[PDB]
């Protein structure tokens, strides 16, 4: 018989050995095992396609130690059986006549599954048949990547725009009479198979593809017929990383020899394996350049819609009209949806991650869609993708976060009526690994949204090598100080909510008051002292987990007031009070480069000018920002569940490749 | 009062009053209240204040963003007991233009554990590094042991749990205003238990945190508060549990005013890692040989016991389990260990295949101090491979640099999606991979009836570690080697030598074997075709083992061994697989009991030459020169029993690795 597909071949003097070898495999030859006793040296010959590596511990005679091992490899497929050969000639002590000779006849067979492991936009061969089985993060790492299909049976037509999925090439090569003996099996674990789909084009250039592997088929058989098989398969991921799926999927090809005796089972001779990582879902901070501006113009194409639309024009950003959904709560375009992206070397896909807390959504061409499951569905439930803010890229005590860090609001401690993100959604976020999430304390808010006490704005200081962002933070203490400063100047008669109409103040549950009155409202100060404490707790957290300094923080005067949650049934109405903005929150701004669309506060007016608007411009306009105040008081004070003119902005995906990070 | 503020804004008109939690940095904006004319300042503080003027009689220059962080070293004795004064100066004016004052009160609120793994709780200077668990010799992070013992009172012998100390200090007029809340996430709470010894009787303990309590309130009254808590894990790492559990103490001030809610001022968090379940290879020294003597002490148990005494190892009798299939002690249980700096716990991991209703009684009374832990499984058939008996630990190895100081778990499975393939269930496989410290290796054993790799491979401990070598040897079955040996014997004229010579008629007939001469064996075409198939399977594993354990041919020794292919008949015929599986033809020489250099090898009853087995002679020629002392076990019935039938089995408890698992980098 032939010593085929064996890691070690025992050489023989009487008769030669014949073996069939899969390309890339190392065969160890025990040269000293069959060496006569007299021998003390040998000479080794080989054909061209054979690579001989003698181990440690013109004719060239090498010493025959005990043991003496030499590993043989085959570089290219054999053109015919036994078309390569190795000969070991043993020599006795001082005779010059060869004592004996051992002969090996090799046939080289190629069976390789190859993918784009070097992330150069093409399927590249991997010489290291062991390294191709690993997926390593970092600039020195490697590993093919797989994109989740974000487009909303046994055969499917994929057009050329969608055929930008990952590529996996199966190459089989060798003498026909050898290849005919075996069959191939492309397979993966059943768990893995339920996490991606493999399609095979039925004919070259055919838009028609057959699902060879998928959730219902973890094994696909291929018949070898002596030709030099060359087939490209197309894989697509079906789900982002999750708590039970690290994102790694392996595919293998196994060589099988059907049995010639029914009693004897069939035999397995070789297996090659490749690895894909499912690219994670990456969220984009507001410091990134705006590209599109989606507005849920809820029959209110004026005020917010008109000014926001104008703002995007100033910032060179497109506007897309979103259609209101009757089955969804108000402000669903931002509280229940988020712009994100998932990247691979061959294609970048931007999409909406939707977290229905309650299906018709029409995006600009090329923008994907994906639904993430939620568990809590309250009106003020903090278990929505809206309870999330992405910090700009930062560097905390060495460790880099080039894609920023997701920030999620929860209850700092197990409060009696605390609220927080569900396990399902939090687990989804933590599994992406590339924007290490940070827990913030926003349970004191009624909405739970951190955009009501903080907001990031882009600076061009990175030209000088600076951080390139600023953190704006609500500070009731700064507003009280400003109002007290105006009082010292004699402007205590100035009135908050001055240029506002009674049908708006009364419907929005606010009443106008002078600087002297607010600075005398004792309950209002106790409430704003409570909020000031909450904000400083988040200030200490943010400075820690984002590596911020006080030079990065700009306090913005902002007042709040504590009110019960009344937009839900009384049976589930929390007894405690939650914070709501007293006047339109200045930190809920629309950031578009240096153009800032800030909500108009309607603060006390001095010489016909809002003192809050004047102070905000004094703070930011010297930094190069263009404040543009949006006059819609009804929209900015709308209830938690009521309908408002919503807005959500698509932004440029990070230029940094997420796979070059080291989580 | 700017109590617990990250930044304090100074003022020349009035001083600031603040409470500072020990270990926290308060940033001071000196330039904010600096008079415009000023170009320099002087900063003084009290002994307990640490002032770090950091930014990009002594006068320091006053830059535009002049910032300084103040820290407190020890708790304040009384409110405002410590002060910092910044005096600002104008240009060419000896008179100080102004002064700002801050009053600091230092409060300690620290939750501390043994993060440096020296068996004692240690204060953590870095309040943010203690939240991290870092692997490796330069890492840190406290460790937790699972409870493997088969209000609550716990004796001192069982009081070897992990310790978590809570310390609070500071003036009482301040502490009395707040309360503590020791808590953990709801999910984490369901992974461990925290007990607090009552101040009355130390032997009695109260469950402050557990699977039904993720928050526990303590009222802060006195100047000083110190309480020690004892933590135990309840389950090893799994697919739904990385092994990290954190506990935090939050400082809460109650709100007298009904309209305003309570306020959170500070939180200290510590992190524990649950120590994984580590399996031991047979190259480690034996301590106890457990034997399930199924009402038969003649061949197997009698020999094993004598080998155990010869090897300086105790012997422990195992009560036979009437509700479990035979060989359960070997096939359904494994001796593991979980290690912590304070304590190492050896235990038995049982994967009961015997059924979902395998019931109320677990008749295993191990030696004192030996734990017990059940791992659930999915497949419970007779020839199933979904059990901890389908597991072999490799010796410590190095593969392309990456080290495996605890060895590598090896699991049998179907290499490819066979038509009737078998493997470990997801549940068991996930449990094993979750341990991370013995990174599993998938091997091909679906071709054997039992699925056990012990029937084709065995590790034996060499003492060449004194010579800086690997310290083990890999014995591998070789049907080809056995044929070559038999052919040599035929060539010498011994073709008449008879396999199974010294065995009686009742033995062969009951164990389904027929004596044959060497001439007959070498003639049996089906036997050659059956062992050629087994040769192909083993050679595939040989490549896997060399790659994933960094082995060379010098590490491998071929042991002559023959097999045969048979249909699984020990089960109902309606569930009988169509295919054939390999079984040892004559007693498997590799299913040996390894105790140091004393090797208990099954007696093969091979062809005899001059009244001596040639298989025993070959085995001794191979291994005795390497220092091993072979001792053949004569029990033909035991080593040829069917899959489900009763056997005299053994399971040896061995020394846990010396290497501390937490010092490796998976």
- What is the end-to-end Cα distance of chain B in Å, rounded? 49
CA distance A469 to B217: 41
Alpha carbon B22 to its chain centroid, in Å, reads: 36
As a dihedral over the C-alpha atoms of residue A202, residue A208, residue A209, residue A215, rounded to 10 degrees, the angle is -140
Evaluate whether B347 touches B332 at the Cβ level (below 8 Å): no
Determine contact: A405 vs chain B, CB below 8 A. Answer: no
Residue with tokens 């295949």: B353
CA distance B508 to B498: 13
Evaluate whether B567 touches B577 at the Cβ level (below 8 Å): yes
Chain B contact probe: residue of A54, A187, A550 with most B CBs at under 10 A:
A550
CA distance B418 to B385: 14
Chain B contact probe: residue of A1, A3, A7, A580 with most B CBs at under 10 A:
A7
Among candidates A7, A523, A576 on the partner chain, residue whose Cβ is nearest the Cβ of B539: A7
Q: Do B183 and A269 touch (CB under 8 A)?
A: no
User: Solved how?
Assistant: X-ray
Residues whose CB falls within 8 Å of the CB of residue B602, separated by 6 or more in sequence, listed in order? B587, B588, B589, B591, B592, B632, B633, B635, B639
Evaluate whether A386 touches A332 at the Cβ level (below 8 Å): no
Strand, helix or coil at A223?
strand
Determine contact: A194 vs chain B, CB below 8 A. Answer: no
Residues whose CB falls within 8 Å of the CB of residue A569, separated by 6 or more in sequence, listed in order? none
Among candidates A6, A264, A413 on the partner chain, residue whose Cβ is nearest the Cβ of B530: A264
- CB < 8 Å to A533, chain B: 4, 263, 265
Among candidates B260, B529, B553 on the partner chain, residue whose Cβ is nearest the Cβ of A530: B260
Q: Is the Cα dihedral A308, A309, A313, A315 positive or negative?
A: positive
Give the closest residue to A213 by CA, choosing from A164, A251, A160. Answer: A251
Among candidates A7, A261, A269 on the partner chain, residue whose Cβ is nearest the Cβ of B529: A261
Evaluate whether A408 touches A439 at the Cβ level (below 8 Å): yes
Residue with tokens 């309607």: A602
- CB < 8 Å to A538, chain B: none
- CB < 8 Å to A185, chain B: 416-417
Determine contact: B448 vs chain A, CB below 8 A. Answer: no
Residues composing chain B? 666
Max distance between CA atoms of chain A, in angstroms, equals: 121
Residue with tokens 């709501």: A580
Q: For residue A67, is the peptide bond before it cis, meaning its omega torsion is within 30 degrees of 0?
A: yes
Q: Do A67 and B426 touch (CB under 8 A)?
A: no
Name beta bridge partners: B404. Answer: B397
User: Distance, in angstroms, between B530 CA and closest chain A CA?
Assistant: 6
Determine contact: A550 vs chain B, CB below 8 A. Answer: yes
Q: Is the Cα dihedral A324, A329, A330, A331 positive or negative?
A: negative
Residues whose CB falls within 8 Å of the CB of residue A23, separated by 6 or more in sequence, listed in order? A74, A75, A76, A77, A108, A109, A110, A111, A112, A173
Give the closest residue to A444 by CA, choosing from A454, A432, A453, A434. Answer: A453
CB pairs under 8 A, 24+ apart, for A91-96? A91/A39, A91/A40, A91/A41, A91/A42, A91/A43, A91/A61, A92/A36, A92/A38, A92/A39, A92/A40, A93/A38, A93/A39, A93/A40
Give the closest residue to B162 by CA, choosing from B233, B210, B226, B212. Answer: B233
Evaluate whether B345 touches B148 at the Cβ level (below 8 Å): yes
- CB < 8 Å to B29, chain A: 550
Q: How many CB atoms lie within 10 A of CB A484?
A: 12
- CB < 8 Å to B259, chain A: 523, 526-527, 562, 577
User: Distance, in angstroms, between B537 CA and closest chain A CA?
Assistant: 8
Q: Do A536 and B5 touch (CB under 8 A)?
A: yes
Chain A contact probe: residue of B3, B52, B241, B553 with most A CBs at under 10 A:
B553
Q: How many CB atoms lie within 10 A of CB B639?
A: 23
CA distance A268 to A4: 12
User: Distance, in angstroms, between A472 CA and closest chain B CA?
Assistant: 15
CA distance A261 to A264: 5
Among candidates A185, A413, A543 on the partner chain, residue whose Cβ is nearest the Cβ of B417: A185
CA distance B150 to B413: 32
Residues whose CB falls within 8 Å of the CB of residue B284, separated by 6 or more in sequence, listed in order? B461, B654, B655, B656, B657
Strand, helix or coil at B195?
strand
* φ, ψ dihedrals at B16, nearest 5°: -100, 145
Q: Do B264 and A441 touch (CB under 8 A)?
A: yes
Touching A: B residues 290-349, CB under 8 Å: none
What are the CA-CA distances from residue B481 to residues A6, A328, B605, B618 (Å)? Answer: 15, 74, 17, 10
Burial A510-541 (b: 16+ CB within 10 A, else e): beebbbeebbeeeebbebbebbbbbbbbbbbb
Q: Which residue of B has its CA nearest to A192?
A: B426
Residues whose CB falls within 8 Å of the CB of residue A308, separated by 6 or more in sequence, listed in order? A293, A295, A590, A597, A630, A645, A647
Helical (H) or strand (E) element with A423: helix A423-430
Q: How many CB atoms lie within 10 A of CB A243?
A: 14
CA distance B288 to B316: 7
Q: Which residue of A has its CA nearest to B529?
A: A264
Evaluate whether B595 touches B575 at the Cβ level (below 8 Å): no
Give the closest residue to A552 by CA, choosing from B500, B402, B7, B625. Answer: B7
Determine contact: A271 vs chain B, CB below 8 A. Answer: yes
**What count of Cα atoms within 13 Å lies in the side-chain half-sphere of residue B69?**
11
Q: Which residue of B has its CA nearest to A417?
A: B261
Instruction: State this model's resolution in angstroms.
Output: 2.4
Strand, helix or coil at B663?
helix
Determine contact: A268 vs chain B, CB below 8 A. Answer: yes
Q: Which domains does chain A have, with CATH numbers?
A: 8-109 (2.60.40.1860), 116-278 (2.60.40.1700), 282-660 (3.75.10.10)
Among candidates A6, A268, A537 on the partner chain, residue whose Cβ is nearest the Cβ of B416: A268
Give the closest residue to B21 by CA, choosing from B262, B215, B250, B248. Answer: B250
CA distance A142 to B350: 40
Chain B contact probe: residue of A5, A30, A221, A268 with most B CBs at under 10 A:
A268
Radius of gyration of chain B (CA): 34
Specify the DSSP class assigned to residue B214: S
CA distance B181 to A541: 19
Q: Is the Cα dihedral B192, B197, B203, B204 positive or negative?
A: negative
Q: Do A1 and B532 touch (CB under 8 A)?
A: yes
Q: Do A264 and B529 touch (CB under 8 A)?
A: yes
CA distance B490 to B485: 9
- CB < 8 Å to B264, chain A: 412-413, 441, 534, 537
Alpha carbon A469 to its chain centroid, in Å, reads: 22
Max distance between CA atoms of chain B, in angstroms, equals: 120
Chain B contact probe: residue of A264, A273, A579 with most B CBs at under 10 A:
A264
Strand extents, DSSP E, B256-328:
263-274, 278-279, 286-292, 314-317
Two tokens, residue B506: 């009742």
- CB < 8 Å to B536, chain A: 5, 267, 269
Give the closest residue to A478 by CA, choosing from A536, A562, A548. Answer: A536
- CB < 8 Å to B267, chain A: 412-413
User: Distance, in angstroms, between B579 CA and closest chain A CA?
Assistant: 7
Among candidates A265, A533, A539 on the partner chain, residue whose Cβ is nearest the Cβ of B263: A533
Last residue before each break in chain B (C–N > 2.5 Å): 56, 150
Name beta bridge partners: B269. Answer: B248
Q: Do A67 and B554 touch (CB under 8 A)?
A: yes
What are the CA-CA distances from residue B366 to residues B305, B316, B646, B650 (Å)? Answer: 17, 8, 21, 14
User: Distance, in angstroms, between A500 CA and closest chain B CA?
Assistant: 28
Two tokens, residue A166: 């990952």
Two tokens, residue A345: 């070397």
């Amino acid at each position: 018989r032939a010593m085929s597909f064996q890691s070690i071949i025992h050489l023989s003097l009487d008769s030669p050995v014949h073996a069939v070898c899969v390309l890339g495999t190392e065969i160890c030859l025990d040269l000293s095992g069959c060496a006569p006793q007299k021998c003390q040296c040998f000479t080794i010959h080989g054909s061209g396609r054979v690579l001989i590596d003698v181990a440690n511990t013109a004719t060239i005679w090498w010493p025959l130690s005990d043991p003496t091992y030499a590993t043989v490899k085959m570089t290219s497929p054999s053109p015919s059986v036994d078309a390569d050969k190795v000969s070991v000639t043993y020599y006795g002590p001082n005779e010059d006549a060869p004592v004996g000779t051992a002969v090996l006849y090799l046939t080289g067979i190629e069976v390789s599954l190859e993918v784009d492991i070097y992330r150069n936009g093409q399927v590249e061969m991997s010489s290291d048949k062991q390294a191709k089985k690993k997926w390593i993060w970092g600039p020195s790492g490697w590993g093919a990547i797989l994109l989740v299909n974000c487009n909303p049976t046994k055969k499917v037509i994929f057009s050329e725009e969608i055929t930008n999925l990952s590529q996996m090439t199966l190459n089989v090569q060798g003498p026909s009479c050898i290849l005919k003996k075996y069959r191939l099996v492309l397979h993966t674990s059943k768990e893995e198979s339920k996490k991606a789909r493999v399609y095979w084009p039925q004919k070259d250039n055919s838009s028609t593809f057959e699902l060879v592997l998928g959730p219902d088929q973890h094994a696909y058989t291929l018949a070898l017929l002596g030709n030099h098989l060359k087939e490209t398969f197309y894989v697509e991921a079906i789900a982002f990383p999750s708590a039970e799926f690290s994102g790694l999927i392996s595919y293998s090809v196994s060589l099988v020899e059907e049995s010639q005796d029914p009693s004897i089972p069939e035999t397995v001779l070789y297996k090659d394996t490749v690895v894909f990582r499912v690219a994670p879902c990456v969220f984009i901070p507001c410091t990134q350049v705006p590209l599109e501006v989606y507005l849920c113009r809820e029959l209110q194409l004026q005020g917010f819609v008109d000014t926001v639309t104008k703002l995007s024009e100033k910032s060179n950003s497109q506007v897309a009209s979103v259609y209101e959904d009757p089955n969804r709560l108000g402000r669903w375009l931002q509280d229940e949806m988020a712009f994100c992206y998932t990247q691979a070397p061959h294609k970048t896909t931007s999409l909406i991650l939707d977290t229905p807390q309650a299906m018709k959504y029409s995006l600009s061409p090329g923008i994907g869609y994906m639904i993430q499951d939620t568990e809590d569905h309250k009106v003020a439930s903090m278990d929505s993708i809206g309870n999330l803010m992405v910090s700009p890229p930062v560097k905390v005590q060495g460790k880099e976060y080039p894609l920023g860090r997701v920030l999620i609001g929860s209850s700092f401690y197990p409060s009696a009526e605390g609220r927080a993100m569900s396990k399902t959604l939090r687990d989804f976020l933590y599994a992406q690994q590339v924007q290490a999430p940070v827990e913030l304390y926003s349970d004191w808010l009624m909405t739970g949204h951190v955009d009501e006490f903080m907001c990031f704005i882009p600076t061009d200081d990175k030209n000088e090598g600076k951080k390139g962002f600023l953190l704006l933070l609500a500070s009731p203490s700064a507003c009280y100080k400003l109002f007290r400063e105006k009082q010292k100047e004699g402007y205590g008669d100035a009135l908050l909510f001055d240029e506002l109409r009674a049908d708006q103040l009364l419907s929005n549950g606010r009443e106008a008051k002078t600087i002297d009155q607010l600075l005398a409202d004792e309950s209002l100060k106790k409430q704003n002292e409570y909020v000031e404490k909450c904000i400083h707790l988040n200030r200490d957290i943010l400075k820690t987990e984002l590596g911020l300094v006080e030079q990065d923080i700009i306090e913005i005067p902002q007042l709040f007031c504590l009110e019960k949650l009344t937009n839900i049934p009384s049976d589930q109405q929390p007894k405690r009070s939650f914070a709501r903005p007293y006047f339109p929150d200045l930190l809920r701004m629309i950031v578009m480069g240096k153009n800032l669309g800030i909500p108009k506060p309607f603060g006390p007016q001095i010489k016909g000018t809002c003192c809050l608007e004047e102070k905000i411009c004094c703070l930011l306009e010297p930094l190069g920002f263009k404040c543009t105040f949006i006059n819609d008081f009804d929209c900015y004070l709308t209830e938690v569940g009521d309908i408002c003119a919503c807005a959500n902005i698509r932004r440029v995906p990070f230029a940094f490749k997420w796979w070059k990070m080291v989580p």
